[PDB]
Amino acid sequence: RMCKDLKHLIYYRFNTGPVGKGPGCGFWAAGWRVWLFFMRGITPLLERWLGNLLARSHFDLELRAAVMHDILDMMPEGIKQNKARTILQHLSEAWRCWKANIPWKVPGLPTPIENMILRYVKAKADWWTNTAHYNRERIRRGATVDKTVCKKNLGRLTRLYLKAEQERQHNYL
Amino acid sequence: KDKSKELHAIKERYLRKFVFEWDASEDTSIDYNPLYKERHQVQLLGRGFIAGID
Amino acid sequence: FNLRSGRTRRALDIPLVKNWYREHCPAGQPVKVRVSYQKLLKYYVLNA
Amino acid sequence: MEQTLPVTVYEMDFLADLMDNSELIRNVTLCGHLHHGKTCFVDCLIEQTHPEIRKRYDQDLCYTDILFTEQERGVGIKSTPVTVVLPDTKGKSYLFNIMDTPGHVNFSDEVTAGLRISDGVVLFIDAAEGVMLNTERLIKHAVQERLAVTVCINKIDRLILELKLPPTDAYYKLRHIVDEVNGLISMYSTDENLILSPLLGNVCFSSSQYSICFTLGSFAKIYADTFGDINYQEFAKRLWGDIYFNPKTRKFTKKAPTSSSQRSFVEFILEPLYKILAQVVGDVDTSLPRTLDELGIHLTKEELKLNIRPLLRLVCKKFFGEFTGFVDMCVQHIPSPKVGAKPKIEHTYTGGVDSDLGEAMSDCDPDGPLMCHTTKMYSTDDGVQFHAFGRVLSGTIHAGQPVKVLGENYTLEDEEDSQICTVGRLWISVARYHIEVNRVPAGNWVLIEGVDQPIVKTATITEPRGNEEAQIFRPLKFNTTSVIKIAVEPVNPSELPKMLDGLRKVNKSYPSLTTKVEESGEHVILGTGELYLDCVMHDLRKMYSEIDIKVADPVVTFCETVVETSSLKCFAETPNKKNKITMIAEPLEKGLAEDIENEVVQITWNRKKLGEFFQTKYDWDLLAARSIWAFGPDATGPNILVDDTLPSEVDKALLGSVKDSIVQGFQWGTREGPLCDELIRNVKFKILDAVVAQEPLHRGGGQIIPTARRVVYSAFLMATPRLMEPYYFVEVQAPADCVSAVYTVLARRRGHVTQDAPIPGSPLYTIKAFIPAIDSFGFETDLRTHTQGQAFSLSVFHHWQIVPGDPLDKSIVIRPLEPQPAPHLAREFMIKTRRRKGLSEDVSISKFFDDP
Amino acid sequence: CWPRDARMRLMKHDVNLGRAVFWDIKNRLPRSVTTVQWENSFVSVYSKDNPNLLFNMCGFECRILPKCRTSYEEFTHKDGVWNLQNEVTKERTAQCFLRVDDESMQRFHNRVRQILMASGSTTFTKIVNKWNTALIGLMTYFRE
Amino acid sequence: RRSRHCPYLDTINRSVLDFDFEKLCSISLSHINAYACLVCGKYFQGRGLKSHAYIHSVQFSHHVFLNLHTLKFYCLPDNYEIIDSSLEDITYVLKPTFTKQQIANLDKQAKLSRAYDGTTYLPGIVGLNNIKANDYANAVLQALSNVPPLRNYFLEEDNYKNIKRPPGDIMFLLVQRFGELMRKLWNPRNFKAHVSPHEMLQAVVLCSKKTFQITKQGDGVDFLSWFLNALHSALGGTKKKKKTIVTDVFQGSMRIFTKKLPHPDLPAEEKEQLLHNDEYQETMVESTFMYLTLDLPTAPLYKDEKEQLIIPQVPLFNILAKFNGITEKEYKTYKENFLKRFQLTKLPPYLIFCIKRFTKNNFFVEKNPTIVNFPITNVDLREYLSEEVQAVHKNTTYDLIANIVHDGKPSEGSYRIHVLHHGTGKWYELQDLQVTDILPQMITLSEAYIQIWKRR
Amino acid sequence: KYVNGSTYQRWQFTLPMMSTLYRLANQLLTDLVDDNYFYLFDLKAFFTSKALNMAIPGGPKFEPLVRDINLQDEDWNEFNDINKIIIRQPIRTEYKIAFPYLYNNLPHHVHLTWYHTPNVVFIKTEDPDLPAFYFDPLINPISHR
Numbered sequence A: 001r002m003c004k005d006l007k008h009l010i011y012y013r014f015n016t017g018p019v020g021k022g023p024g025c026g027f028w029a030a031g032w033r034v035w036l037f038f039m040r041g042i043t044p045l046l047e048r049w050l051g052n053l054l055a056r057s058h059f060d061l062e063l064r065a066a067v068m069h070d071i072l073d074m075m076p077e078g079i080k081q082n083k084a085r086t087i088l089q090h091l092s093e094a095w096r097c098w099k100a101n102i103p104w105k106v107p108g109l110p111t112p113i114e115n116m117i118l119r120y121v122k123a124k125a126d127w128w129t130n131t132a133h134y135n136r137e138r139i140r141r142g143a144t145v146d147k148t149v150c151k152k153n154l155g156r157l158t159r160l161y162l163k164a165e166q167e168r169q170h171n172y173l
Numbered sequence B: 001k002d003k004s005k006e007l008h009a010i011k012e013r014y015l016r017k018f019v020f021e022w023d024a025s026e027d028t029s030i031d032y033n034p035l036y037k038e039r040h041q042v043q044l045l046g047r048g049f050i051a052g053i054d
Numbered sequence C: 001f002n003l004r005s006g007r008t009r010r011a012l013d014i015p016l017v018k019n020w021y022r023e024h025c026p027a028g029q030p031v032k033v034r035v036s037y038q039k040l041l042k043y044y045v046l047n048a
Numbered sequence D: 001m002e003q004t005l006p007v008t009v010y011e012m013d014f015l016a017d018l019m020d021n022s023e024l025i026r027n028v029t030l031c032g033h034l035h036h037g038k039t040c041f042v043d044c045l046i047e048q049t050h051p052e053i054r055k056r057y058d059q060d061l062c063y064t065d066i067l068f069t070e071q072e073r074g075v076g077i078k079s080t081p082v083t084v085v086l087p088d089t090k091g092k093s094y095l096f097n098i099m100d101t102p103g104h105v106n107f108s109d110e111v112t113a114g115l116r117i118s119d120g121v122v123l124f125i126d127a128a129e130g131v132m133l134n135t136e137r138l139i140k141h142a143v144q145e146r147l148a149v150t151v152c153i154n155k156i157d158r159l160i161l162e163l164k165l166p167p168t169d170a171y172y173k174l175r176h177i178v179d180e181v182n183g184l185i186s187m188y189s190t191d192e193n194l195i196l197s198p199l200l201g202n203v204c205f206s207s208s209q210y211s212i213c214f215t216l217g218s219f220a221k222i223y224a225d226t227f228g229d230i231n232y233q234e235f236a237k238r239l240w241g242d243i244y245f246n247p248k249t250r251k252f253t254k255k256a257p258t259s260s261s262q263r264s265f266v267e268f269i270l271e272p273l274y275k276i277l278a279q280v281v282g283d284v285d286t287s288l289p290r291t292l293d294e295l296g297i298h299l300t301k302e303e304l305k306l307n308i309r310p311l312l313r314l315v316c317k318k319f320f321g322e323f324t325g326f327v328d329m330c331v332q333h334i335p336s337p338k339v340g341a342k343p344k345i346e347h348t349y350t351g352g353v354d355s356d357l358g359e360a361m362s363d364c365d366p367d368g369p370l371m372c373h374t375t376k377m378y379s380t381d382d383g384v385q386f387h388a389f390g391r392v393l394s395g396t397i398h399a400g401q402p403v404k405v406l407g408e409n410y411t412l413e414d415e416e417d418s419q420i421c422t423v424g425r426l427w428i429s430v431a432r433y434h435i436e437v438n439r440v441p442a443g444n445w446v447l448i449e450g451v452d453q454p455i456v457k458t459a460t461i462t463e464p465r466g467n468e469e470a471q472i473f474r475p476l477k478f479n480t481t482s483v484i485k486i487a488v489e490p491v492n493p494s495e496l497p498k499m500l501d502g503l504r505k506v507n508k509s510y511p512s513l514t515t516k517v518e519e520s521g522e523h524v525i526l527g528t529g530e531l532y533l534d535c536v537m538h539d540l541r542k543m544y545s546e547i548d549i550k551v552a553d554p555v556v557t558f559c560e561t562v563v564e565t566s567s568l569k570c571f572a573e574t575p576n577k578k579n580k581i582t583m584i585a586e587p588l589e590k591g592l593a594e595d596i597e598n599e600v601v602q603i604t605w606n607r608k609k610l611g612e613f614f615q616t617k618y619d620w621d622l623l624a625a626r627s628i629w630a631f632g633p634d635a636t637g638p639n640i641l642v643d644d645t646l647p648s649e650v651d652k653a654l655l656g657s658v659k660d661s662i663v664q665g666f667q668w669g670t671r672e673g674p675l676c677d678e679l680i681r682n683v684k685f686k687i688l689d690a691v692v693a694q695e696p697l698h699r700g701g702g703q704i705i706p707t708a709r710r711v712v713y714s715a716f717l718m719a720t721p722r723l724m725e726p727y728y729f730v731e732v733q734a735p736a737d738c739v740s741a742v743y744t745v746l747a748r749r750r751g752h753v754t755q756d757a758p759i760p761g762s763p764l765y766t767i768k769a770f771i772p773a774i775d776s777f778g779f780e781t782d783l784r785t786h787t788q789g790q791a792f793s794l795s796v797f798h799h800w801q802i803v804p805g806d807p808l809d810k811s812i813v814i815r816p817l818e819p820q821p822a823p824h825l826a827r828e829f830m831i832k833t834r835r836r837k838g839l840s841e842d843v844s845i846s847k848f849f850d851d852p
Numbered sequence E: 001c002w003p004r005d006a007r008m009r010l011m012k013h014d015v016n017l018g019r020a021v022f023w024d025i026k027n028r029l030p031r032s033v034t035t036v037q038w039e040n041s042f043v044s045v046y047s048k049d050n051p052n053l054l055f056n057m058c059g060f061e062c063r064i065l066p067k068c069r070t071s072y073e074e075f076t077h078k079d080g081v082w083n084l085q086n087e088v089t090k091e092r093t094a095q096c097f098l099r100v101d102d103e104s105m106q107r108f109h110n111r112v113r114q115i116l117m118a119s120g121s122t123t124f125t126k127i128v129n130k131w132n133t134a135l136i137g138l139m140t141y142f143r144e
Numbered sequence F: 001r002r003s004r005h006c007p008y009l010d011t012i013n014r015s016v017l018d019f020d021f022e023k024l025c026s027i028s029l030s031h032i033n034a035y036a037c038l039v040c041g042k043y044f045q046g047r048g049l050k051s052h053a054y055i056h057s058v059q060f061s062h063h064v065f066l067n068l069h070t071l072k073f074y075c076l077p078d079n080y081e082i083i084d085s086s087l088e089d090i091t092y093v094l095k096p097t098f099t100k101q102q103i104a105n106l107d108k109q110a111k112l113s114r115a116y117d118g119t120t121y122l123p124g125i126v127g128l129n130n131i132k133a134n135d136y137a138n139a140v141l142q143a144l145s146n147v148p149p150l151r152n153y154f155l156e157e158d159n160y161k162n163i164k165r166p167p168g169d170i171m172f173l174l175v176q177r178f179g180e181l182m183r184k185l186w187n188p189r190n191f192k193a194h195v196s197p198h199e200m201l202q203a204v205v206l207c208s209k210k211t212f213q214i215t216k217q218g219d220g221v222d223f224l225s226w227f228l229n230a231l232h233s234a235l236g237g238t239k240k241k242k243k244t245i246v247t248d249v250f251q252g253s254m255r256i257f258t259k260k261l262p263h264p265d266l267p268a269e270e271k272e273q274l275l276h277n278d279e280y281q282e283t284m285v286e287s288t289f290m291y292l293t294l295d296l297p298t299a300p301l302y303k304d305e306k307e308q309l310i311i312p313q314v315p316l317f318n319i320l321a322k323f324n325g326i327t328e329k330e331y332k333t334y335k336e337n338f339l340k341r342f343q344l345t346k347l348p349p350y351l352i353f354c355i356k357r358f359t360k361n362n363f364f365v366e367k368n369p370t371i372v373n374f375p376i377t378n379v380d381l382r383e384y385l386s387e388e389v390q391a392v393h394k395n396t397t398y399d400l401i402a403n404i405v406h407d408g409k410p411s412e413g414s415y416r417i418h419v420l421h422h423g424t425g426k427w428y429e430l431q432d433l434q435v436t437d438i439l440p441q442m443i444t445l446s447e448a449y450i451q452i453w454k455r456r
Numbered sequence G: 001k002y003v004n005g006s007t008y009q010r011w012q013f014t015l016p017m018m019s020t021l022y023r024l025a026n027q028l029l030t031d032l033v034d035d036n037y038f039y040l041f042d043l044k045a046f047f048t049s050k051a052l053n054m055a056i057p058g059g060p061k062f063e064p065l066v067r068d069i070n071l072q073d074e075d076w077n078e079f080n081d082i083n084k085i086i087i088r089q090p091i092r093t094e095y096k097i098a099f100p101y102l103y104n105n106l107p108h109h110v111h112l113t114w115y116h117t118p119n120v121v122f123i124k125t126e127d128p129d130l131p132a133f134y135f136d137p138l139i140n141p142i143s144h145r
């Protein structure tokens, strides 16, 4: 667009006087400048691409996979071939018990594994509260969502509003 | 139109496609004021001249 | 041209027509050269 | 002290020792028109006295203009003091207190703050532009503040390098400039002993771009140091002014030999200056070294490689040397201040020279009673603390010494505007560094720390426990009137206090600033123009309060006048129902308001001289002329209070019992006024009758002041009231072709062109016009945009003229956001001001009577 | 939702009076029984400075503008404007300009978004029936 | 001579006499010679002809003015002084002065004081006005009121007026406007039972450079930290005067025992070989605290069977388990985990506990809702001290005297404060203007954010 | 004599060379003797106009630097009361660029333009057969005495 700009700048000074319209104007230094200043910027891009060539939203899923990966590493191989599915059910059960404001204490669970599940539930809790409030500002603002996002959001906000309401009742007591 | 744009200027002071050309809606210098449309080009003592023009 | 000594500049670095769109666009010009003057000024000002 | 000061040609012990000897001090205001070379001249003096402070090659160091808005605008905005030690032609070093004042006419008030603490004036005149608007206005204000006036015709290189005049014709240009300044001084002064001519040394010629500065004596001393046997003062007596040189008899004749010989100025001064500038700018490579060898100048090989303007500045720095002609001129023709103490005390002290303290202030002695006087407040760039700047007229301020600051409302009977403040520190204020001193003797200028709290504009610092009969110096009578009125609120009201704090601070910084709050709670700043208020608003938002501030549209303050006498003789009784006052209001005679305002008359006169004036000048009877009570809202205001009460109907001692309260109510009534609460102008208030209560607890004070205001208001309103417009006098400096463009720009804004006259010796014209100040908002922007920058206008307040409408006209409908036509502009101007003021929607003529 | 000359004009006496009225009402209610919050309230002063009296009641946004007070005009019949006349003398003394609350237009918009979002696997007749039902409810409640 | 016989002294109404604000002329903005009109409360440049007080007196028929600096009353336009002892409460509301007998008996004041309107109050138990979002600072300023020695310092202006300032020093405005506010809050003869802190807060806004605004509320711990540090900075005369009243009242000396843990991802041979490196040994970086920061253990993420409330609960001694020489706190910065132990060496006379409620997680700021179960009339802090120290410290028993409580979300929160009135034993919840009488058993049920304790 | 050397870094020219190079480049240069031509058209003027979301007529137009004050969202204070405002001329874009602190509420990131520089009254010499110092007829005559 800029070179066309310079053409309009140059031609309308060039084509004054006895010079009329026509293909005879060549004052090429302006456009040639512009294309060299483009070459300045994309020289290291194409050089980095040739050096690479001529060589030699879902935080709950990532967080659950990361804590499952962290739990598994410190398990022995003779015990993790039975135990791993069960600790995923323990993760999901602690998260279901957090979402329900009910006590989750497994007595047979060892307290470092229990502390890591507690940690996972706190990280997912903070993400879950934040994504419920963020998706609610999205929905309430008028941003375009589908049915399962609203349904999911309404379930998250119902559990959050009842956590706040149970805290309100216990503050009254 | 220009009296309309003058009182509009008052009334608002207080109250995919590759397009290779600039639009005429991108334009400025659509003035109402005759001191700013016809803007008395420099007579450089009648001896200096604008660049490029013949 | 007000100098008599100077440092040599690249031919890229010398815009022959920068002080042309930095002037006011002359009288009687069509709309496309006027918006071209204003957009050359726009990228001049964004550069500076 | 011992602070870290820059390297200078003198040393600061010698500056502090020249401070004591007040015969070797020159308190000088460098004043002129906008961009006439004053700041670059101070730059040249600083480069002379400071070897490490050097101007850049392509961009002039200003070295005053130390504000950010000054560096960005390029216009000097505040006066910067510079205290240097400059050597004379004889080699004698004098202490120079130089006030670099803004030449823009909107900042004329700042010049007044420099004119008060100065004993002399160097009026800077562009040699190309000649005498301009602010040069005439500062001639007037300099000979009216009783200052010695000298002239520096700066920018003589524009006669050489721009106009390319012949040397005879540029001599004619400089002679026309000197003649124009002489005509202006003979206009504004009955005395003709202050004739300005370069033969006298009153006129200096300069080019502060290229560091040329010579009087005739300092150019003659270049001959005297080049050729030995010549006595340069007798030569300087022959150099200017239709004196030709006969080189066969070697004698200077008034008769021209050969009829093609040149004057002594053209032959001996202007043609060498032209040949220096022409050999530098035209023939540097070919023939500059042989002419430089002829002038005794040798430049290094690195120095001849310079571009043509730094090489010109260098060649003329080596030829002319120091600026000893400026020091010649300001030492011979600007007082001592020992000599200049007596006109300064006679003019600016309220007790006058005849007081017991006026005598000791005329002696100017450092071992006297302390009588410092500060006119400027200089903010430090943190914005918090101000420093009061002014001159010590007697005694010695000391750092750490408690002191008695008297504000402008301090009289000897109203001693409450004083305050005992401890002086924190003292600075000898050069522009970009301050020399911290332990004491400052009399005659010297000083920045004082710690006295900034009890003062707004102008202080008299005295000492406590003595000087009990110490009066204030007069407040700064300004060159113009702060007229342009902007309303100012914070964007967030919670930071109103910061803005109020900042409002106080701009009230300290700008001497003719008026910050008030109107009855609607609207904060109002009065200024002299749109550049002035743009800088005030910049300082308000950036320097002092760091908050965001909404500005209103700029409006003007109006005046109020009458055009005929009052229909019925108006009256007002007090709330006691005793003390009826009966006034009429009639318009003053033509030119009388100009006589009261410009101090052609005073109520401080006796009754005999005042009555003699009003009899011999305006056809008043001596019955009426001996009956003048007061002079408008101040002691010099455009209204008159007369009593035409016959002594048959009224007891005259019982009337003089309440003369003070009737005068106070009249002054307050003419200060506010009943149309739009803005000053009454050009109205004679005749007290026709006055019942007065017999016992003093029934008259006086709370009864008769508001009653006198009510009868002033009703007498005003029954006379046919008109609003008055401030009119700006606009001097446009356009090219010859842009004159019809200036006419076209002025025709859209109710401006009447007074004149379009060619600047003689320049290709430009001056269009002098009269725009209304309500129509001047963006006028200079309209003019410089329409003329592509070629025309340039300066607009200053000239007079008040009656708005073409009638303000008490309920027949006029005003749609709110439209430009009204002329024949009901006053009706628009009255009620919107009334809305701004917040008063009632309309003022009826019967609002201040007793019948309704 | 009203134009700037049609809103409450925030003059100092009227703003102080609105806040004063609100403070007087707020002191009468103990903060433990119920609160009355300024941020969810609206206090419109009609005075010599504000010619319009404004209130949102029942989803309607009403602006009463007296005939004596910034009309100066012959009016034809406009729809949302209610010619308020005096009961005894039958003189049109004010006009009530009606509008729909922004919360009510937002409720209708969110109702259509609930129709569309839960449309999904439903019949076109049921989507258009929900549109008809929301449109009749809006249009018969908010008529003028 | 017409002093003591002024007619216009009935025209004064004290219902409009608000002396809490900037003493500037309401027309000319000038602080020089400001006079309050006692008929309308508005300030006008004071005294003389053509001034604003004079022109106001003849404009409004408001004929009695008080010099706001000189404390002398004046009838205008005919300017004479007014000498009447019945006007003394106007000057005492404008400029409250406190004698040493009045300061020593200031905490022995059981009888209520009456304002000019029929509103009883106790001095110091006085509401601070709420400008937009202000209750953090009202709560902290009401906490530093009811601290007796800091109060008694700021009730005499002579305690701090003559101390030296830098020339362009704005920071002393905190000291003098805090003293003005303290004298207005402990004024026993006020005209209203509440004091606007607005000038004190404009000093806060200017001195913190738009940290701690009035339109936007900050945290009380941040404001108390900055405000005690800024009072201590500004009460030092052109230097760090090492002992101000803020140091003499609130500052103690703790002994932090930082111990660098080696690195967790190492083998055991290298992990116990790094012990002799002495970079991984204990230090002693003994310092001074204005306030002790008490860290609550986090909200337990699940309810339990007991105290069937969802509200968690810690004793005071369990979060004062920090600051004994046994309990080690993990510190975690980049590349380095330390084990800081704390040890109180100098216990202040008035000890501030800033209980840390608001912590930011990965996504938002969460408030710890944990209720500290503290006593209010006895905490023996003797066993949080070294035995090198407990022979010096004769009195270590502290009573609670102020309890700033944050209520609500970290976003839409409010601040109230339970102050103990001395002389009575009564506790008052001041939420900014309302003063409830709170019970001593109900202080320990609220979310204690800031606490001030008195060493007896 | 005329350049640095073979690196071609510094040139130093004789003023006849610079004069004839200036004459050969006459068509590319506008013969303005000032920067008064660029009043409200220089860089500062355009930085100001970009900062105020205003477009100088011959000049560029940008996105708003700050979010604009909608003048139908402000709610008729005593300050912006349009019944108090005397309208004489429309306050143009140019006046808010020329005096950005007088005519703008919230001038942020705004640049004070250079004011007047004094009018360079340079008389171009049409005739080289004329003396270099010559009373040109563009110069207004000085009437003697």
Ligand SMILES: O=P(O)(O)O[C@H]1[C@H](OP(=O)(O)O)[C@@H](OP(=O)(O)O)[C@H](OP(=O)(O)O)[C@@H](OP(=O)(O)O)[C@H]1OP(=O)(O)O
Pocket (backbone or CB within 6 Å): A004, A007, A008, A011, A015, A020, A021, A022, A023, A024, B021, C032
């Ligand atoms: O401005 P553009 O859209 O890029 O088109 C231009 C334009 O043609 P139009 O006027 O029809 O738009 C020029 O004509 P003028 O501006 O002078 O009126 C013409 O230049 P000439 O007519 O003087 O030859 C030029 O042609 P070119 O750039 O090849 O010289 C041509 O560009 P296009 O080749 O894209 O049509």
Ligand SMILES: Nc1nc2c(ncn2[C@@H]2O[C@H](COP(=O)(O)OP(=O)(O)OP(=O)(O)O)[C@@H](O)[C@H]2O)c(=O)[nH]1
Pocket (backbone or CB within 6 Å): D033, D034, D035, D036, D037, D038, D039, D040, D041, D060, D062, D074, D075, D076, D077, D101, D102, D103, D104, D154, D155, D156, D157, D158, D206, D207, D208, D209, D210, G117, G118
């Ligand atoms: N041709 C020529 N130009 C000069 C000379 N002296 C100063 N100038 C230029 O004229 C302009 C005047 O600026 P200043 O001298 O700094 O301003 P001033 O005269 O003090 O006036 P204020 O702007 O009001 O302060 C500057 O840009 C200088 O570059 C001179 O002697 N000859």
Ligand SMILES: [Mg+2]
Pocket (backbone or CB within 6 Å): D038, D039, D065, D075, D076, D100, D101, D102, D103
């Ligand atoms: Mg200057």
Ligand SMILES: [Zn+2]
Pocket (backbone or CB within 6 Å): F037, F038, F039, F040, F041, F042, F056, F060, F062
């Ligand atoms: Zn009053």
